[PDB]
Every structure is written in C-alpha cells, then in structure tokens.
Amino acid sequence: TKPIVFSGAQPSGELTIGNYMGALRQWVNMQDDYHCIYCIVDQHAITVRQDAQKLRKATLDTLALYLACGIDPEKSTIFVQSHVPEHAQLGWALNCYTYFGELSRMTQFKDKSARYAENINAGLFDYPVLMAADILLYQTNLVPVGEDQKQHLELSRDIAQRFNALYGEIFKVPEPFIPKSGARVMSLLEPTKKMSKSDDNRNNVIGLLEDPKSVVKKIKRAVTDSDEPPVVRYDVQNKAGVSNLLDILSAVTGQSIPELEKQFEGKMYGHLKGEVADAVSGMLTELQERYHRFRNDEAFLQQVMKDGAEKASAHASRTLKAVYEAIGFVAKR
Amino acid sequence: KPIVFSGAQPSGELTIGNYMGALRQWVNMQDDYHCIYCIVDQHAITVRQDAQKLRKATLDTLALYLACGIDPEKSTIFVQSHVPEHAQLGWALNCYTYFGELSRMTQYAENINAGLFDYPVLMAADILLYQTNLVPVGEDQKQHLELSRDIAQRFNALYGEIFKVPEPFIPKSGARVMSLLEPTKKMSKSDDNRNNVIGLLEDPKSVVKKIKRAVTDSDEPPVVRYDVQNKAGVSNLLDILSAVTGQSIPELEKQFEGKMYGHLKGEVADAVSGMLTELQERYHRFRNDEAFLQQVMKDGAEKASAHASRTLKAVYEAIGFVAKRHH
Ligand SMILES: Nc1ncnc2c1ncn2[C@@H]1O[C@H](COP(=O)(O)OC(=O)[C@@H](N)Cc2c[nH]c3ccccc23)[C@@H](O)[C@H]1O
Ligand SMILES: CC(=O)c1ccc2c(c1)CCO2
Numbered sequence A: 001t002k003p004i005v006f007s008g009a010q011p012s013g014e015l016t017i018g019n020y021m022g023a024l025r026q027w028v029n030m031q032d033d034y035h036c037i038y039c040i041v042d043q044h045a046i047t048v049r050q051d052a053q054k055l056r057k058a059t060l061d062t063l064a065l066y067l068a069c070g071i072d073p074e075k076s077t078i079f080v081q082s083h084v085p086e087h088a089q090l091g092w093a094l095n096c097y098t099y100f101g102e103l104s105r106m107t108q109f110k111d112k113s114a115r116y117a118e119n120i121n122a123g124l125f126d127y128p129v130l131m132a133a134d135i136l137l138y139q140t141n142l143v144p145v146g147e148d149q150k151q152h153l154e155l156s157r158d159i160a161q162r163f164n165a166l167y168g169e170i171f172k173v174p175e176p177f178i179p180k181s182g183a184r185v186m187s188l189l190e191p192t193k194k195m196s197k198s199d200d201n202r203n204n205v206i207g208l209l210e211d212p213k214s215v216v217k218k219i220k221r222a223v224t225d226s227d228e229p230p231v232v233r234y235d236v237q238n239k240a241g242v243s244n245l246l247d248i249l250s251a252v253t254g255q256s257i258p259e260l261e262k263q264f265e266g267k268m269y270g271h272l273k274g275e276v277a278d279a280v281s282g283m284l285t286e287l288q289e290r291y292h293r294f295r296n297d298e299a300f301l302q303q304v305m306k307d308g309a310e311k312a313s314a315h316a317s318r319t320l321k322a323v324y325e326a327i328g329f330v331a332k333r
Numbered sequence B: 001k002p003i004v005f006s007g008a009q010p011s012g013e014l015t016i017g018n019y020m021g022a023l024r025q026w027v028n029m030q031d032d033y034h035c036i037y038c039i040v041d042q043h044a045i046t047v048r049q050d051a052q053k054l055r056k057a058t059l060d061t062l063a064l065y066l067a068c069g070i071d072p073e074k075s076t077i078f079v080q081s082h083v084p085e086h087a088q089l090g091w092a093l094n095c096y097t098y099f100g101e102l103s104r105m106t107q108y109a110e111n112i113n114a115g116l117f118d119y120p121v122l123m124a125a126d127i128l129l130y131q132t133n134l135v136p137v138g139e140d141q142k143q144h145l146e147l148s149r150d151i152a153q154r155f156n157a158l159y160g161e162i163f164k165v166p167e168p169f170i171p172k173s174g175a176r177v178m179s180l181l182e183p184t185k186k187m188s189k190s191d192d193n194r195n196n197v198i199g200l201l202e203d204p205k206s207v208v209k210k211i212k213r214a215v216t217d218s219d220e221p222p223v224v225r226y227d228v229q230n231k232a233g234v235s236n237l238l239d240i241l242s243a244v245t246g247q248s249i250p251e252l253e254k255q256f257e258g259k260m261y262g263h264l265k266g267e268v269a270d271a272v273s274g275m276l277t278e279l280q281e282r283y284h285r286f287r288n289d290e291a292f293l294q295q296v297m298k299d300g301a302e303k304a305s306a307h308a309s310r311t312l313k314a315v316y317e318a319i320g321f322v323a324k325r326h327h
Helices: A017-029 A052-069 A086-095 A100-104 A107-115 A122-136 A147-167 A212-220 A240-253 A257-263 A269-295 A298-327 B016-027 B051-068 B085-094 B099-103 B114-128 B139-159 B204-213 B232-245 B249-255 B261-287 B290-319
Strands: A004-009 A035-040 A077-080 A142-144 A175-177 B003-008 B034-039 B076-079
Touching (some): A035 A298, A052 A269, A086 A298, A086 B085, A122 B099, A122 B114, A147 A298, A212 A269, A240 A269, A298 B051, B034 B051, B051 B261, B232 B249
Parallel strands (some): A035 A077, B034 B076
C-alpha cells in the first residue's frame, strides 16, 4: 500500500493564492504518488464564530474549489470533518496526552486571541489537539501545509511519539511537506504579514474566487521599495514586497528565482507587476471556470461527500478501535 | 417524566455511605424519572492509569450499579465511550465556552494535561445531550453544573431552544454516614485512609474488624445516646444502624439502654454485613456473566444513542454544518 497523505482547509473566510501555493498546489501534485486524503475542516472553522448560512455555503464552496484545483475524487478521498465522528472521539482522547503548556505557547492561539478578544474560546485553545487527531486517524505519513502550520504539525509528532512510547505502534509519526516556493505568501500592502483568508482589508489579498480584473488592480498597487534604481531581486529583509511578487510569479509559472531575476535584468517594477498580473489573471480565470461547473452541480457535490466520508470512516474507525483498546476502554459491541 | 443524568466514575470502590445515601435513594425513583447512568470512561483518562485496570473497573462499576438495583429495563445505563455523540458535542461546546471560564474553575499549570483543563466542557456535553432536566451533584461539581447551564443558555440565546437548561436535584438522601476513625468527616469513597470506610464488597470479618476500631467516647458509664457534638462516634454508629434496619434513633436508644459500646458495635457489624450479603451475591453473579453485561452495554448504548443523535443533529443544524450523507 502507498504512503498516506492528509491535509485540510477551513470553510471560513475566502481561500487565497497563499492557501493555494502553500497547500492546495501540493495536494493536487501528490495524488498519484501517494494515497491522498483531503478534509474540509468545518469543526476547526467554528473556533472563530461563523454565521450558520455562511458556514454551510463556505463548506460547499471549499469542496468545489478543491475539485476546481484538480483534486480528483477517483484518486483522492475528499470529506467533511464533521461527517466522521472519530475526529472528535480521538481529539478528546489525545487531549489527555497533550500538556496545557504546549497549547498556551502556540502562535496561532495568541494571534487569533488578539484578533477575537471577545471570543477567546476553549476550541481556539484546543485547536492543535483536534488537528493532531485529524492527522493521526489516517496513519498519515506526510502532511502538506504552509509554513504557518509547522508548529501545530510538530505537536502532532510529539503526541504520536508520546502515545506510541506507552502503548506500541498505534500511530505513524507524520512528517511536514512544506514547499520551497509559496510556503508563506505575504500581504500586498503589508508584506511583513502573511496573506490572510479573512483580512479586514481586501486589498491585501488575492482571493481564488475574486474577479480577475480586481486582482490585477490590487497587484498593480502592491507595495515595493524605495530602491534607486529599482531592481528586481529576491531579498525578504530589504525588499519584502518585490520578493513576495517574485515568489507568487515563480509559484504560478514554475520559473526559478534566478531565472526570473535574469528575465528582469534592466527592468523595473512595472515589468514585474505586469507579469505577476498576467500569470495570476490567467490562473484565476481558468480555475473559476472549472469552479462554477462543480459548484452548481449539487448532485455531484453530494456524491463526493458521501463517498469520501465512507472511505474516511473505514480508515478512521480502524485507528480509533486500536487507540481505545490500547488506553483500556471496554470495546463497543 | 423528567430526565435525570448521573455520571459514574469507573474508579471508586463504592462505600455504604454511597449506597445508603444517593444510590438507594435513586434505585427507588426509577419509575418517577427517566434516569440515565453514564459510566464515564472518557473522563477517567484525564488521570494517567493502567489500561487493563480501567477496562476491569468499567465492568466492576457496571456490575455494582446493577447489583445495587439499577434496572436496565427502567433506566438507561451505558459506557460513555460507546456513544460518539459525547465527544462530538463536547468539541462543538468547546467553541462556545470561554477560555476564562475554564481557567476560573476552582480545581505549575504548564504540566497538567489538557483533558484535566477541558473536562468540564465534556461534562456539559454529557448532560445537554439527553435534554436533561435534573442533575444530582455533590458540592465539588456545583461549579461544573453552573458552567453547563451557562453554556446551554448562551447557545439557546444564539440558536433557539436547542437545549434544556438543567437544574440541580436539591433534596438529599437523609442517611448520615460518617468516617469510622473521624466521625466529624463524611464517609467518602475518595478518602485516603480506608479504615474510615466500609466498601460494598467487604466480607464479614473485615466489617467486624473496622467497626471494632470505630471511635466512640470516654463517657462513664458508657451510654448509647445520640449526640453529634459530644458523642460523634456513637452517634455515627447509631445513624449507620438506623440506615440499615429502618429503626428510629429513639427506638435504638431504648434498645441499647444499659448496654456498652461493644454491643452497639456487634449489632452494627451484623446489620451492615447482612445488608452487604444480598448485594455481594448479586454483584459476583452479574460481574461474571459476560453475556449479560455485554447485552446491558449494547442495549444501553442503543437507547442513549437514539436520544443523543437527535440533540446532536439539532446542534449541527443550528451551527450550520452540512448534514452527513449516509450510505
Ligand atoms: N499566506 C499563506 N501562504 C502559504 N500558505 C498558507 C497561507 N495562509 C494559509 N496557508 C496554508 O493554507 C492551508 C489552509 O489554511 P487554513 O487556515 O484553511 O487551515 C489551517 O490552517 C489548518 N490548521 C487546517 C487543518 C486542520 N486539520 C488539519 C490537519 C492537517 C493539515 C491541516 C489541517 C494550510 O496548510 C496553511 O498553512
Ligand atoms: C469532549 C470535548 O470537550 C472535546 C472533544 C473533542 C476534542 C476536544 C475536546 C479537544 C480536541 O478534540
């Protein structure tokens, strides 16, 4: 049997070109090489308060977007997290093998808490433990994520090793799969802050379902630097904006940074922004064309969810049964 | 009938205090209420422990509740982990519980496991799943019941009347059972010193031995009279004897006129062991009938799941999750 790939994305906010290059692009590319399982993590989404109608719509939007990206339900398992009870069941169990201190030191908890001061909830704090359960349920070998999830992923490894040390080879210890390019795509007007899928200022973001004409305008207004003369060179510390544009271009086109720097020799930020705008506009036009075809076919979305939950449940029930036997529960019959 | 929820820890060896207090009280109200007994194995694992002992203790607890007279045809009795909806609802309610509320629980903190921090949310889920009206709580879990009520009202305020707001079951058992070597302190299963307690599985020789050691007083002549302030020990022995036999304190004070504490102790031991005879007979019979315990757990989980699934579906619909597609 093939090694197992697992990853997920939240049906909240609006997925960006950051989410694509950091995760979804890798998801699509791994489907033949590994046994891939992709999850719409609606139980994680509700750690930030959602409108009920928006949550339901976003779950289905996210499914259609996976399909539009090239996630193929004949090759990969695609499912909604809340459809498989074993996620919450294992999450509770792993809560008992996770330390309070490990969770309080998490960067996401701190950042989200600062942002949502009036809803610092226990789910937000416990976020990483449910994420560990998501991964460990499927005997996962590889987890394709962006740089921002590295810390959560490291806890999942710690939990698996801790549990295995007491009980035997119950879990696989998963490894991160973080790409070379596009692992941390930055905001267009604040290039020292990563691109957010729920940014208050939409001008920071390239949304995957956003009007391409609007995206082209946003790229043209992206902040660069005061260098005289302007030079197109990758340098995160001194040229955050220009570097972010190069990273985006590289990730869309497949061209390396040295190749792009050569291409832009004797050229300035007009040429750079023109190429980024054209590459991104084309990608989004094609993606959105596929998206609407999937999004408006409710019978197909319903079948994909049904088949995916069924396949996921088979894997998940097996791991949970072994966990419950190990920790000492009376088995259900 | 109102729905009553009780969580049973698969860990405590129950005492005569537990039995003649709350358990006997509740055994006789199984047709008055819809009583639910949940053996809380998911709560147990917040404290690291031996796995085979936990499995054993789960079955020990099931057999003992059955032996004490919990009727699986009248009441619902099940193992918590057999009903996935507990964990499912628990996660959901985690997202409507303030971090501050959990840190403000009465209970450095860096090395506690997250389960020990977060278990009040699972407790709330346990209760709210079954549209519970009444929860018998000890003083130690009043804060936890209040959190469950706050969560229920908060969720209901956002989404409609999804949950019943549970109430404490106020009226208490009436049987008084204090510690044998410290009669000011209540006989508790959680006591470190086990000579303070009489467990439900103790044989007659162990009961005689523990009751012989029970503290009395230096009154001369010895006098068997009820006086909690001056004669805590003798009073405790009278309350225990009264709880077992149903004889009043005045009747027993008359029965032991001119008698010494040796006679009192002898009668208490005989009365207690007489009560524990039918109980232990039932226990050892039920505990060693694997098929009977299996059927009780299966039937109980089925009844509980039917109720829990309806609540969870309403919760999930309210939050806005896409409904599972069944095959
Ligand atoms: N600016 C950016 N540049 C590059 N990559 C980025 C950027 N912003 C986000 N990402 C990545 O996108 C993926 C989905 O993010 P979410 O916030 O939906 O979702 C998250 O952040 C996960 N916790 C969801 C999850 C739940 N359970 C799991 C189990 C395995 C893997 C992932 C999960 C992520 O890989 C994230 O790293
Ligand atoms: C019962 C409960 O409170 C709970 C359930 C699932 C879960 C957590 C908590 C933390 C990670 O996943």
